Every structure is written in C-alpha cells, then in structure tokens.
Amino acid sequence: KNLTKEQIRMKNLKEAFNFYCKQQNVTGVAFTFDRIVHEQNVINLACFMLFLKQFNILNKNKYVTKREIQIMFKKYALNYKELDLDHFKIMIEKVAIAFYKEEENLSNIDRVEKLYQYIEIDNIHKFRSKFGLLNQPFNIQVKPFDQGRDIVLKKVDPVVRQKVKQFQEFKKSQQALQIMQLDQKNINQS
Amino acid sequence: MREVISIHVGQGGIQVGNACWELFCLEHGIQPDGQMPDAFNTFFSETGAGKHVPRAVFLDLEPTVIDEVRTGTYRQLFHPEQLISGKEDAANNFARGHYTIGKEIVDLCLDRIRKLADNCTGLQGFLVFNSVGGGTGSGLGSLLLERLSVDYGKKSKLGFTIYPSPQVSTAVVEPYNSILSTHSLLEHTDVAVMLDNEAIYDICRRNLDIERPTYTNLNRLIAQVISSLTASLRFDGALNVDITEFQTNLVPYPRIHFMLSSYAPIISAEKAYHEQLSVAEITNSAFEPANMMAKCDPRHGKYMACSMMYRGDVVPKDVNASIATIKTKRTIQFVDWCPTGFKVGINYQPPTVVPGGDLAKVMRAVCMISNSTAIAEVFSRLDHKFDLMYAKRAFVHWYVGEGMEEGEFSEAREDLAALEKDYEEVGIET
C-alpha cells in the first residue's frame, strides 16, 4: 500500500498527533467515555509545547517562546483549547513561519518544508524515536542482578533439529514398533 | 518405618561409636540399661516388652576396647553377640586386615548384617565409622564395603573417615594404608566426610577454651554432627531432608564425593548467654575458614554445592536473608556452572546437651556439609608423603609378606593422580 506525499507525511504526522493526544494529563473526576474519546482525538497546549520541546523548536528563538506559542495556540485552536488533526497541521505551519521568520528570503511554503526536514518527518523511524512521554507505569506501588537477561534460546535450527528432527521420526518409528510389538505380543500371547 | 544401620570398626570407630550412642540414648530418653522409665525406630528396635536394642555392630580384632565396652555401664544395652571381636591385631598393617585375619572374621559380620537387615522394612542406608590410619580399621572397612556393594547393590553407604593431620601424626606408616584405603573406598562409598584431628583440636582450643583436650571431647563433637545430620529422619520439621536426597544435590559427578563439614555454634556455658546467638551470626560463623572440621582452607578453592542443616526455632525467612548476605561477600565464590548451590533444611528439635560435657544448651544451631574444590590439597600432601618412602621401597616388606602383590601400591598412586587431575578439570570455568 501507499500514501500521498503530503499524507505519508500526513500519515506520519497523524501518528505523532495520535501519540501526543494520549499524553494529556486530564484534570477532573468521573469523566464520561465520550469526553475521554474526545480528549484522545485532540491536543492541548501542554502536549503541543511538549511536541515542540521534544523536536527542539520551543524557546530556540524569540518567535517560538512559551508565551508566543500560547498566543498562537489560543488563536488557531478549536474552542481556544484544543487542536484536532487539521488544526494541528495548521499550527505546525504557523510555527514554521514563526521559527524561520528572520529568514526573509524564504517563502512560507519553503519555511514549512524546511521545518518538515528539520523534524525528519520523511523518516518514520527517526521521527518516532523523538516521541517522548509525560508519565505512566501500570499501577504497581513501586520502588546486583537488575541488569537485563536476554535469554537467547538455542536454535533447534535447520542444522540442529535435523538430527533432532531425524530423531523425532525415529522415535515415532520406535513407538510404532513398540505398539506393533505390543500388538504382536498381545497377538503372540493371544 | 525408616531405619539406618551404623557400622563401627577399629579402635577409633568404636570410641566414636560410644560417643554417639550416649548421645542418642540421652536424646530419646532411654536409660543406659535400655529401659524407658515413635521416633526411636530410626536407630532402635522394640523387643516386644521393655528394652530397646541399637541397630549397631562393633568390630575389632584387638579385644581390649570391646572388653571395656562389655563391662561399662552400657553392658546391658548391646546384644551380647553383635560385638564381634578377634584375637590378633593387624598392628597397623593394611595387608593383614585385608588378606590374612580379616577374611576369617568378615563372614560373621556379614551374617550379623543380614540378621539386622531382615528386621528393618524401610532401610534408608548404612553408616560406617573407621579411623583410616590403622591396619584393622582401613582393611576391614575396605573389605566390608566391597562385600556390601555387591550383596545389596544400590543401598546408600556413608563413611565418616578420619584422615591424618597435615603434620601431626601418631604412626609413621599411616600414609601407605591411608592411600590404599582411599583407593578402596573411592569406587565403593557414596559419601565420605573429612574428619582430621588437628582442625578439631584447634576448634576446641579457640572456642571451648580447653587447653588439654582428650579424644572424648573430639568424639562428642563428631557425635553432635551425626545427630544434626540424622535429626530430620526422626523429628518433625518445616523443611525435611532424607539421606537418599544427597547424591542429587551434593555430588556433581560420581567420582567427586569427598566433602568437609563444619558446625556452629560451639560455646561454653560461662559466656554463651551474654550474646544472642542470632541465626545470621551462627551462619556466618559456620562459613568461617577457621571453623572447618577438616584442616583445609576453603579460600584456596571454589565451592561446588553447600548442604546445611538448621535445628531449633529458626524461621525460613531469616535463613534466606542470611544466604543472601553470604552470596554478597567477595571472599566466598562459587563455581561458574552452579548458579544456586544451597540446600537448606530446617528442624524444630533443639540440640540436646550431654551432662558433664563441654557444649552448653542453645536454641539454635547450624550444621553444614559443603563440597569444595579446595579438598585436593590433602590428597596432594598425602601423595607427597607417600612418594618419599615409596621411592626407596621402605616398609614394603611388611606388606609383601602378608600376601599383597608388589604392583598394588602403584595403581593406588595412579588413581590418586587421576582424582587430582579430575578435581583440576572440574574447577576451570567454561
């Protein structure tokens, strides 16, 4: 299967969007599942700043400071609080225009293209490796041998099983012979 | 329905058998006359009404010790005709007690063994005691083991041999018969425990604070070790261990079954109660190299497997918390191919005290049976002592003239060389 150039980019951007939507620290008690589903499909200001920080854009110049990003977010966000996937794309384009604002010779399209190269969005593995959390464990009240143990199971492999394989066929033939000998003993004792 | 038969041969064997048989009778409440004024069944048998008879047999060619036994306070306990006695001593000559005078006595002993075995229904195994550096002891022990290995087969036999000290010695010819007896029991005994006298002398001097010990003090400690080993068969415990559950846990390979023991605590009543005797400190003292019951340094070799018994009010979690501390220490290192090497047993009955003895009454004790690679030093030094006199063929005429062939000395030397090579081959990491 394949995706369009803006979309492959669009597919990778959607993957980043869906990842950061799930990082939201939702404040409040006893939510509806509709609200939880809504909040999983939108990015808040904190998660958008986290995205810009992890991609090394936040506070890099005077046009991408925490305050400037907050003003931009309130101006372009849905309900002044939330970004959907389309508003997230628009916000990244606005951040690209702000981030490269001092480069007068660049068109707005070239500024967005330069930002997409800067975040390495065309390489899904490098793009995904920049995704960072906020926090979770799986609820487990936590606190010489800690270093990890990669139990490399011995390949009972094509060369190794071969004898073992040959051995399974031999063992089946021996069991069939023992059944035939038990049947022949039952027939010869009969 | 679980039984065990103990064999005592030679002067040292009989003198340690006396030591263990005061302790067992005291521990089971049986008076010296044999009369009580269901745990006894492991060592004793009921006669129907009244007295109990030990499942033990005493062997010797020299009659003095048996006559001393048959006139002491324990004259009424033992069956009159299981104290087999000879007329002529082997006189420290191994060839005598294996070829000349032991053969005419061994048949009566085997008949007694059969008569005792037919009574038992759940026979766990045999115990044997013999001081190695003597003629009759080593020779008759070898002959009895060789006969039993074919009469019964797979039954387990345990040997509590007393090897000579590194430098302290009573005889002058004991390396010869020690090497020959090691040859004989290498392929014939399932477990052999080291018991040389010098280490136990040092233990008594340092802990018991006795400056003039005699053989009885040594034999009492050995008896306590035996009681600690066999307590699990006759008392209720949270984590039991049987005799047959040893070659599966302490014996990595059929050739390697020589291990050395230790015991803790050893302390007198004058200063025992001033300290709390926690489980951690006793299990630390048990692993101290100076408290080994055989004069060998465990720091010179790796460990292979450690089987160590507790008794008293010890709790398993405290035992685990102390095994972890020992695994932590950098001065004790185990062999590479053994990740876990500890077998733990816990029993509830505290050790019993013998009146007029040295040890005091305590609520916790630990006995360890540890198999280590460092044991090869005693074999090497015994071999060096043997070679010095075998170079000039000294004292050989006392052995050739008793029916033994000339070449019999060489093959024992070859088997010791093979054992020493095997111990080196096992201890190298992969």
Binding site: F138, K154 | T244, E245, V251, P254, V315, T340, V344
Partner: protein, 430 residues
C-alpha cells in the same frame, strides 16, 4: 453438581492441602469431626462440590493424597482436621525419590501410580457431573514434579474434555533450598504446558516479601504462606458454591483468560491484606480493594507486572456491592494504565460478583491476570539450567535410571520456544 475432586502430591502439596481443607471446612462450618455446625442455610446447599456424604451424617472430602514417602501423610493425619481424610485414599511407597525427577517419573513413580489411578478413577466415575480436577504440587522436588506431571498426562488421556487446574510452586533463585532445582523444574515445565488447561505459579520469595511488607509480621512461617495460598485457592471457586449477581465457573474463566491454547500461565493475588495494628484505620471500599488488587507488590509472584503488558485480566469480587461501581472502577483502572494493556484486544478485564463474603471479612477480591511479564521466571530458570548443564553436573544421577541427555535438549528447546512465543505477542501491534 459440577463438582471437582482434589488431588495433591509431594510434601509441599500436602502441606498446602492441609490448610486449604481447613479453610474450606471453616467456611462451611464443618467441625474436625465431620459434623455440620453452621449457621446459614446457604452453607449446605452446594456442599457436594468438595464433600461427599456417608452414613451417620458426617462429611468426607474427595481428596487423594499421594507421596513416595510415608512421613508427610503420617504427620498431616495428626494435625487439626486431619481425621476428615478417608484412610483408603492414602497411597505411598517405601523408598522415596530423593529429589530426583527420573526416579519419581520413570522407575519408582511408574509402578506405584496404578494404585492411585485406581482410586482417582473410582472418585471421578461416581460423581454427579464432573467439572474437573485441581492439582497442587511443587516444581522444586523430585517425586512431586515427576509423579504429579505424569499423572496429569494420564488423567488428560482419559478425560480430554474436562478441565484441569494446577497450582505450581516454581523454585526461585533467591530462596533456594535444593541444588538440583533447575533440572526438575525445566523437565516439569516441558510436560506441564502440553496437558494442563490452567496453571498458576506461586513463589515462596513473593510470599515472604508480602508477609514482610504488607502484613508487617515479624516472623513468617510456612503456616502463613499456606494460609495465603489457601485463601487465594478458595477465592477462585467461591461463586461456584454460592449465589451471586454474575456466576462464573472455571470453564468461563478458561474461555475468557486464555487467548491461545499454549498461553495459560497466570499469576494471582489476594486483597485485602492489612496488618493487625492497621486493620481499624482502613475502610473497606471498592476503590480501596481495586487499588491494592493491581498493586505490583501484591502479586503472588516475584515477576514485576509493569515490565510487560497484560493480555487479559480477571477479578472475582466477594460480598454484596453495587455493580455500577465495580464496572466504572474497572474502566478507570484500564484508562489510567493504557500503556500496560495490549491494544489489539479491547475490554480485556473480566469481572464477577459473589454475594457471600469470606468469614470475618465484608469484601474480598481474587485477581487472576494473564500477563507477558511471566517470561522473566522462565528466563532465569533456563539460565541456571544452561549454566549447570553445560558441564554435565549431577547428570549421572538422572542418566543412571534410563534417561538421556536428548530429553534434556528437547526440554530446553521447547522451554526456550515457549519463552520466545510468549513475548512474540508483547511486541505485536495492530
């Protein structure tokens, strides 16, 4: 109806059963003399699940006790509630296995198992509608891990459609009491995956950790570990013996917790657990139960459940409570921990409510979760096994009774394949 029989083997299994049956009898108000003295009508309606009826109005458990040595069953009979067991069901040998898997599975366990299979067949053929069998045994011992697992295959061959439970204690490397634990653990895991419909691993190390940290009692003993295991065992089948809002037998749990037939190794935990001094401070509420239920330290295994992702989970609430609160709390524990739940199977938590709480408690919860974090136990067991096997240590004991190294190689390969294919689904994504 839909009742199950109890079969236990080995010393550890016998000690577990000796407390499990005490707990069941106390729950149903049965005196140690077999006479009912309960208070509520519901205490007798479904007593046919575990107890049979005999003349004179007394009740007898349908338990079968087997071991290769008579000591443990001769000891459990003298304990409390020891008279309930029918003397005919006691089957034992005269030799024992000595922690050797080969002896308890090929030479000695094969000849004896006919007698115990006779009584097993007698018990199963008679009962109204069979639900299945539950097995308690230890993987750290020879006779248990051999005879129990061979009996599993023999039972499965004759009743392929019934359900089979096994509560298995695996040897942890922290608290090791036997040196040959890896061999008979690895050999047993090979056979256990092929026949057991459900398996529940329990570790002594986790029990000590729980007793020391949550209950905060000074001196844990085997009685406390047995009591915790017994409470966990009873919690699973509670709704099968009592009415409730959503009854759920063992087969319903089998359907909902096993995605693929080879992934049936669960780890469990019981809540609430509080210290004596803090039992008045706490208030029993559904949030308080569910927060302790998913706590990592509360699991009966040392495996860390936040080192992997749950494939599925189950909870068996006890007592009278509102279902809306239970469902919303289950949803909340799954929304706040989405990282530790596999994403290609939505709504992977099963809940059940039983209106009869344990005696003395108003609410209780039993947790059974199938998680990918269990791989770490097999990893360390195989690591120790391959560290010890490469030198062929202690191999002669097993090879002297008809077994060979090929069965060791196949067992290691199958265990490693299980380890690999169990984590294969951890990295799987939709």
């Amino acid at each position: 109806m839909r009742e199950i029989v109890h079969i236990q083997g080995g010393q550890c299994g016998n000690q577990i059963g000796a407390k499990f049956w005490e707990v069941i009898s106390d729950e149903h108000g049965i005196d140690p003399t077999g006479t009912y003295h309960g208070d509520s009508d519901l205490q007798l309606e479904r007593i046919n699940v575990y107890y049979n009826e005999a003349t004179g109005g007394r009740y007898v458990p349908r338990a079968i006790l087997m071991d290769l040595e008579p000591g443990t069953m001769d000891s459990v009979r003298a304990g409390p509630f020891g008279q309930l067991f029918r003397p005919d069901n006691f089957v034992f040998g005269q030799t024992g296995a000595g922690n050797n898997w080969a002896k308890g599975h090929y030479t000695e366990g094969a000849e004896l198992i006919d007698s115990v299979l006779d009584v097993v067949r007698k018990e199963a053929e008679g009962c109204d509608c069979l639900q299945g069998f539950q097995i308690t045994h230890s993987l750290g011992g020879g006779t248990g891990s051999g005879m129990g697992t061979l009996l599993i295959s023999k039972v499965r061959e004759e009743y392929p459609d019934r359900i089979m439970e096994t509560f298995s204690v695996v040897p942890s490397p922290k608290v090791s009491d036997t040196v040959v634990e890896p061999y008979n653990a690895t050999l047993s895991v090979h056979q256990l995956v092929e026949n057991a419909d459900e398996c529940m691993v329990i570790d002594n190390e986790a029990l000590y950790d729980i007793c020391f940290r949550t209950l905060k009692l000074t001196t844990p003993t085997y009685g406390d570990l047995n009591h915790l295991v017994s409470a966990a065992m009873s919690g699973v089948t509670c709704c099968l013996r009592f009415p409730g809002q959503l009854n759920s037998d063992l087969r319903k749990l089998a359907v909902n917790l096993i995605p693929f037939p080879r992934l049936h190794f669960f780890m469990i935990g019981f809540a609430p657990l509080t210290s004596r001094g803090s039992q008045q401070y706490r208030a029993l509420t559904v949030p308080e139960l569910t927060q302790q239920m998913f706590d990592a330290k509360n699991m009966m295994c040392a495996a860390d459940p936040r080192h992997g992702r749950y494939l599925t989970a189950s909870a068996l609430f006890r007592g009278r409570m509102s279902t809306k609160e239970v469902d919303e709390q289950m949803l909340n524990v799954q929304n706040k921990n989405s990282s530790y739940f596999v994403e290609w199977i939505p709504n992977n938590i099963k809940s059940s409510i039983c209106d009869i709480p344990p005696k003395g408690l108003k609410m209780a919860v039993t947790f059974v979760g199938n998680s990918t974090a269990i791989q770490e136990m097999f990893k360390r067991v195989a690591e120790q096994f391959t560290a010890m096997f490469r030198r062929k240590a202690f191999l002669h004991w097993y090879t002297g009774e008809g077994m060979d190294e090929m069965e060791f190689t196949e067992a290691e390969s199958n265990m490693n394949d299980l380890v690999s294919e169990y984590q294969q689904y951890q990295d799987a994504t939709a």
